[PDB]
Structure formats: structure tokens, C-alpha cells
């Protein structure tokens, strides 16, 4: 399972099981470019979030119900959707994944 492997490799579930996570299959520069696109509000209310003009290839990783450390289990869902990231810093780059419309 792609999710069970990438979450492990990326050290996301080596010392615990993370409920959800999304992996973007686009170039890093292309994703970093989102910090200058459509500005929108973040889930929390703050407004340093941005939505992509286009849809991007992504894989959603969702833990199953029976999952428990040390045996985390994930449901893999591939899709193409707009991403919403919160930016910060200089250069202005993404630091959090807010959602995917």
C-alpha cells in the first residue's frame, strides 16, 4: 500500500499512527507557486491561505478504524483537486496543508 509505505518512509508513522495526510504529486516549485495565487481564508479564520487555480494530482491517506500502533493501516484515495496551503516566511512558502477542494 502506497500510503502505508510513504507514511512510514517519511517518518510520519514510525513512532505513532497519524490519522490523515495528503501527498501532492506535482513539482515542488509548482506547489510553492501557490503562495501567490488566489488568497482565501484558512479554516481557522486567519487569511494567509491560498487556493490553486488548477487541480493537482494528490493521494489522500486515511487511517482505518481497526488501525492501532504499532500496526497503522491506511486507505489510499488518488484524486485531482485544488489545494489550499497556508504560507509564511521569506521567501513566502507553504508551511501547512489546509485543504483540497
Amino acid at each position: 500500500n502506497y500510503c502505508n509505505q510513504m507514511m512510514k518512509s517519511r517518518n510520519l508513522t514510525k513512532d505513532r499512527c497519524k490519522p490523515v495526510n495528503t501527498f501532492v504529486h506535482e513539482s515542488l516549485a509548482d506547489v510553492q507557486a501557490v503562495c501567490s495565487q488566489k488568497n482565501v481564508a484558512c479554516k481557522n479564520g486567519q487569511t494567509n491561505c491560498y487556493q490553486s487555480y488548477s487541480t493537482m494530482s494528490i493521494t489522500d491517506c486515511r487511517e482505518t478504524g481497526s488501525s492501532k500502533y504499532p500496526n497503522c493501516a491506511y486507505k489510499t484515495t488518488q484524486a485531482n483537486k485544488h489545494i489550499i496551503v497556508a504560507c509564511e516566511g521569506n521567501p513566502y512558502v507553504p508551511v501547512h496543508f489546509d485543504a483540497s477542494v
Binding site: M6, R10, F23, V24, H96, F97
Partner: peptide, 15 residues
């Protein structure tokens, strides 16, 4: 050690 931007990259990027 690992910055907020580096964390994002390790956790979400997979070109």
C-alpha cells in the same frame, strides 16, 4: 533543526 517549510516538504511532497 527542521523548519516549518522543511516539515511540509517531508510530510506532503512527492513529485
Amino acid at each position: 533543526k527542521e523548519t516549518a517549510a522543511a516539515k511540509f516538504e517531508r510530510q506532503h511532497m512527492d513529485s
